[PDB]
Amino acid sequence: QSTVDTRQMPIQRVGVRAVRHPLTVRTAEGETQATVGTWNLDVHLPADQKGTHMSRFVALLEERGGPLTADAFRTMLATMLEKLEARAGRIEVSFPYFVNKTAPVSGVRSLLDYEVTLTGDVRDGLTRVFAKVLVPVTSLCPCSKKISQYGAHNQRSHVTIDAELAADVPVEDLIRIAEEEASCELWGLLKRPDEKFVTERAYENPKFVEDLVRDVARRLDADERIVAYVLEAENFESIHNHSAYALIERDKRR
Amino acid sequence: QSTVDTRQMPIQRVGVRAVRHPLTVRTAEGETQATVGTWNLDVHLPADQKGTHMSRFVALLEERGGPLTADAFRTMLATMLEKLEARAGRIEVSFPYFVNKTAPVSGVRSLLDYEVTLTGDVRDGLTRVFAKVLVPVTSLCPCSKKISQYGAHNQRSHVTIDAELAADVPVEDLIRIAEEEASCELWGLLKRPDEKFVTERAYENPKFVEDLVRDVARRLDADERIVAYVLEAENFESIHNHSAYALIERDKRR
Amino acid sequence: QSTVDTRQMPIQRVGVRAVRHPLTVRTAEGETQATVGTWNLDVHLPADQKGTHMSRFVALLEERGGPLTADAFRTMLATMLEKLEARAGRIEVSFPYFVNKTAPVSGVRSLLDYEVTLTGDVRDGLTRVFAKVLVPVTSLCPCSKKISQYGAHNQRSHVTIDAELAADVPVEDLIRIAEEEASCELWGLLKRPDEKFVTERAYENPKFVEDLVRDVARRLDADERIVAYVLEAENFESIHNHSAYALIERDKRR
Amino acid sequence: QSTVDTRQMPIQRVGVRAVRHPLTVRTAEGETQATVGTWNLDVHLPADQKGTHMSRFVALLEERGGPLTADAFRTMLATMLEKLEARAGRIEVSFPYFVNKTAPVSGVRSLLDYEVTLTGDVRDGLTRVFAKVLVPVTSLCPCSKKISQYGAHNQRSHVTIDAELAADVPVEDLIRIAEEEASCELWGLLKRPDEKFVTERAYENPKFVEDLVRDVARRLDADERIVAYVLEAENFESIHNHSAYALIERDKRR
Ligand SMILES: O=S([O-])[O-]
Ligand SMILES: O=S([O-])[O-]
Ligand SMILES: O=S([O-])[O-]
Ligand SMILES: O=S([O-])[O-]
Ligand SMILES: O=S([O-])[O-]
Ligand SMILES: O=S([O-])[O-]
Ligand SMILES: O=S([O-])[O-]
Ligand SMILES: O=S([O-])[O-]
Ligand SMILES: O=S([O-])[O-]
Ligand SMILES: O=S([O-])[O-]
Ligand code: NA
Ligand code: NA
Ligand code: NA
Ligand code: NA
């Protein structure tokens, strides 16, 4: 339980990685969605302690019950520190999140999948909560449209908003900013009139990666509920075998 | 070596998987191209033989020298069967492959990467060789262009040609067929005149995934060198979070 | 809607790939488990038809309701052929599947995740249903144990049973054969006495990949409910950076 | 070039991502090793500049020639900033790296593959260079061995050393530190005497993930060349479907 002097050094994170467990989450309409999560749970290990208890992190996942409300997630972080007899720990869980969506012209309903990561960290007595969402959208190239007699190259794009939250934000709030700022958002089901609509909206609203990151960042900068964010936009170029990438990091405290 | 009756059954494939190993390949331009390969080497195991020798498959990779050519690959398949004391075996290697390309208007030269898989199988008295290439290309939707006042949804597409070879075929020949049948091919480096060119040609040549596979299949059908093939085209839809997909399978001997 | 003569050729499969949709499944205890699936839905396209309707495949997923019982899956395949106006189609869905498990000595309960793929194909008037499960287990090397004064090298292994089913088989039935034939099965939560138990059981039951595939195959050969299977075992070697792979394919009809 | 006030904000990172390109690296043994790299090239964008030139980043890759050495990598970072007309930028390349290795007893020679990431960042008037290597090793559980009558659960482990360099360090030096501190290192080709050797040494040298990271950290702390580092060790538990994980982060300037 105690370290040799050559091993007398603290470990910032020690725990389980990639544990797959089912979870239930709460929508902005208060409804519960069943999803599967990949969990990472770790604690700080004091220089003197030889090792953590790995079994306890799995035990905590089995014990937990109910929707993963922002309140339960904070409770889980505190439960882990008590179960593991630790003073500092991180819990991270990623899962696919589905929003029912209405086609722009037809009104036909379809689910779209977003990748959501929720991270809680307790270090220096300070509890920090982060919500990260990957939103798939459509991007059209302004240069292609300007220099071409007809057509404009467009590609699927991923906008990743990772935000430290001062207060509760629904993920739908983060998804909405990316979808509104995108040349055009994505629907799973589109009838012919909808395809006409999204083809035309994207062309009318071309955006480089730089344009998209700046437009999304300005909206994030205005939401007080967000204290700090890392914003990434990746355009999977249709005319190339690589991607165009823009990153903006903001810490309002600083 | 020796099996119990309960374990007295032949194993069609036994050996090593995912062995990463450097390899040099003689190109159509006669350059020796150095690339990294993931190797799968396996042999049929007779009911009475309890196990193959795993170390020998790795030893063959270390022993082998010089550029990989169609003749060298066949020689390796025979060498392995002799080394492993086996009558039937399969060798599969997948590696990134690069072709220097010339931009359509400016003529600027850039590398484009393809995924090549070379597979040799000896079984039932027959030696079969297969060349599989994943070709990245551009696809433009004919419906989007027809129904829209402006624009046409376009996206990166992968054309996978998996061909059993009656006669040796350079990978470049398979890549060329896919690139020619695509709405537009892909270049790593495009100048603004090139960007204008590829935007326009894609628009002038819209193809559905069904149109793309059918056009590639017709070229494969006309090729005396290819006895049989499994052809796949996937369109990574810009307007959707999923892909459009088509597969044509054909055996000339049928 | 009709093909040019150069494009007058049938396409075996045309449809959507990698569509992520939530689904509910039924356990062998008849209970319902909520899981997320990646769906692939395609139909055969007659030479004359220019193209399928891609929107309909997504519409079918949105329309479907209730647990995905083996009876619903057959109904869905028929519904798709009618919705898409086709005569032949394939529906494939993969999802993580969780079984609550009891530790061997402590009796502590933990969930384990398996990858389950369910595939339905309707071609030549014939309906075929396939259930594929990836089961994670533990493998110990017989050679290492025999030649070493102490210790024996052991690694996580994946056993993949893909089976065409004459009649309904619960996935738990397929998982059980792999877990019983493995040097030792896997538990998410293990107390110290359980770790002693699984350390010792694995050592007492060493199995090469060949031994494991043959032991599992014999059990599959005995289950009439299975008409044909592809069995794969991969050992992720702890002493190497590659894997040991064994494959057995059986078609009882043949 | 020119921004609106709403888009008047700096972008910390803008450029190309996931560009695949061949590269040659001079090895510690002075051999020129040809490998395939995935490149990420980005530059800081000033608030007033509306966009970077994407084509130039690809042009630099095509233009660059000769083996990648520490000096050459620094020269490329400067070349890119001049080519892109930028004052701050990052270049990151990841490639498979092979070291010929000698078996512990038989002395047979086999290649072992590592994942190398070289990152150069110029920002805030400071140029920072980092070498990151993923080293595959073997880990044996000390608890399994102590509590069991026979055997000890062991598994492949990845040790990732991400080091900021005060002075140039060959990747081989980082790999050696991880291999020496591991229960046992990995060889591609092992003869039966070698198998006996590595089985026994691992058993005689059991390490927990906390023990492994602490031992590697002590070597890194003693190294004058490394100013700072993020050290990760992941044990892909044979007895579990998840991984044990530990991370130590250290900045000497702190
Ligand atoms: O590595 S664990 O068992 O503290
Ligand atoms: O499987 S989760 O990453 O969507
Ligand atoms: O997990 S996100 O907060 O980096
Ligand atoms: O799996 S055995 O034959 O090394
Ligand atoms: O191995 S490829 O030819 O399917
Ligand atoms: O729209 S489809 O038929 O490629
Ligand atoms: O995400 S499913 O493949 O487990
Ligand atoms: O999807 S399985 O049946 O090959
Ligand atoms: O090409 S743009 O994204 O500067
Ligand atoms: O880029 S690596 O040094 O984190
Ligand atoms: Na463009
Ligand atoms: Na379309
Ligand atoms: Na072994
Ligand atoms: Na253990």
CSV table of N, CA and C and ligand atoms in Angstrom, one decimal, chain C residues 195 199, chain D residues 140-145 153 155 208 237 239-240, ligand 14:
chain,number,residue,atom,x,y,z
C,195,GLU,N,-10.0,-13.0,-9.0
C,195,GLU,CA,-8.7,-12.9,-9.8
C,195,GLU,C,-7.9,-14.1,-9.6
C,199,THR,N,-7.0,-16.5,-12.7
C,199,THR,CA,-5.6,-16.7,-13.0
C,199,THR,C,-5.3,-18.2,-13.0
D,140,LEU,N,2.9,-7.7,-16.5
D,140,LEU,CA,2.4,-8.9,-15.7
D,140,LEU,C,1.9,-8.4,-14.4
D,141,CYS,N,0.7,-8.9,-14.0
D,141,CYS,CA,0.1,-8.4,-12.7
D,141,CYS,C,0.7,-8.9,-11.5
D,142,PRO,N,1.3,-8.1,-10.6
D,142,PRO,CA,1.9,-8.6,-9.3
D,142,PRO,C,0.9,-9.2,-8.3
D,143,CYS,N,-0.4,-8.8,-8.3
D,143,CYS,CA,-1.4,-9.3,-7.5
D,143,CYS,C,-1.8,-10.8,-7.9
D,144,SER,N,-2.1,-10.9,-9.2
D,144,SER,CA,-2.3,-12.3,-9.8
D,144,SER,C,-1.2,-13.3,-9.4
D,145,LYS,N,0.0,-12.9,-9.6
D,145,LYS,CA,1.1,-13.8,-9.2
D,145,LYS,C,1.1,-14.1,-7.7
D,153,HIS,N,-1.7,-13.2,-14.5
D,153,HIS,CA,-2.4,-12.6,-15.7
D,153,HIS,C,-1.4,-11.5,-16.3
D,155,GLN,N,-0.4,-9.1,-20.2
D,155,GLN,CA,-1.1,-8.6,-21.4
D,155,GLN,C,-0.2,-7.5,-22.1
D,208,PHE,N,2.6,-3.2,-11.7
D,208,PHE,CA,1.3,-2.5,-11.9
D,208,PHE,C,1.4,-1.4,-12.9
D,237,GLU,N,-5.9,-5.3,-20.3
D,237,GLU,CA,-6.2,-6.4,-19.4
D,237,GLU,C,-6.7,-7.7,-20.1
D,239,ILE,N,-7.8,-10.3,-18.5
D,239,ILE,CA,-9.0,-10.8,-17.7
D,239,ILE,C,-10.2,-9.8,-17.8
D,240,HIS,N,-10.1,-8.7,-18.6
D,240,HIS,CA,-11.2,-7.8,-18.6
D,240,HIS,C,-11.4,-7.3,-20.1
E,14,NA,NA,-4.4,-8.3,-12.0
